[PDB]
Amino acid sequence: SLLPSDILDLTNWKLTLPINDAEEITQPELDSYEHSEYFHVNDDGDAVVFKAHCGGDTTEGSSYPRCELREMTNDGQDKASWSTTSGTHTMIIDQKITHLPEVKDHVVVGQIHDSDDDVIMIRLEGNHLFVEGDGEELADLDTDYELGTRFTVKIVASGGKIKVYYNGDLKLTYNKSVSGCYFKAGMYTQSNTSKGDSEDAYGENEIYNLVVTHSL
Numbered sequence: 251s252l253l254p255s256d257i258l259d260l261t262n263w264k265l266t267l268p269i270n271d272a273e274e275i276t277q278p279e280l281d282s283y284e285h286s287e288y289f290h291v292n293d294d295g296d297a298v299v300f301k302a303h304c305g306g307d308t309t310e311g312s313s314y315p316r317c318e319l320r321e322m323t324n325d326g327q328d329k330a331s332w333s334t335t336s337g338t339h340t341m342i343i344d345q346k347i348t349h350l351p352e353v354k355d356h357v358v359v360g361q362i363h364d365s366d367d368d369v370i371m372i373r374l375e376g377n378h379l380f381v382e383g384d385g386e387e388l389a390d391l392d393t394d395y396e397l398g399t400r401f402t403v404k405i406v407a408s409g410g411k412i413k414v415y416y417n418g419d420l421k422l423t424y425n426k427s428v429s430g431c432y433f434k435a436g437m438y439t440q441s442n443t444s445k446g447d448s449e450d451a452y453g454e455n456e457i458y459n460l461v462v463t464h465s466l
Contacts, residue, residue, distance in 0.1 A: 268306030305449025
């Protein structure tokens with residue numbers, strides 16, 4: 251029936267999977283792609299489900315599995331790359347987190363990433379939703395987050411700073427001067443079997459709306 255490309259504008263994204271050696275699905279194949287377990291439209295027909303299990307395959311340089319979109323440009327053919335000091339770069343994600351690993355109950359659901367590592371990540375640890383940078387907490391978004399709760403998170407990079415909003419309310423203004431940045435959205439499960447989780451434990455979220463904008 252409906253495909254993820256019918257719910258979200260996937261033109262300028264590529265997908266990394268938690269299987270097949272962390273396979274990438276790029277455009278134009280992504281326009282017609284789904285995976286019944288990891289990347290598909292929900293039963294209600296109004297959001298895309300992203301699932302990554304703790305036993306999944308991982309990308310080179312990470313120990314954690316993902317089912318995650320990586321920002322592209324030019325009809326999805328070129329890698330996005332922008333700077334926090336030139337132009338204005340915005341991502342809005344309207345989503346709900348639906349499942350966490352049992353032992354290390356940690357997931358990431360939105361990032362800015364650069365050539366080397368994450369710049370910021372939207373992170374849920376249990377009921378604690380916060381912005382992480384350099385592996386430490388930068389600001390709380392919600393200290394009482396219940397699974398299944400729809401929220402919006404907006405990230406704006408401009409002027410040598412990064413702003414993060416939660417349901418419209420500014421929660422963080424963070425100085426940062428970095429280039430080679432790009433957005434990510436989906437599910438990045440921060441556990442694996444070495445943490446004590448089972449192979450079939452998983453993180454899962456549902457994205458209802460997703461937008462990236464850029465201005466000079």
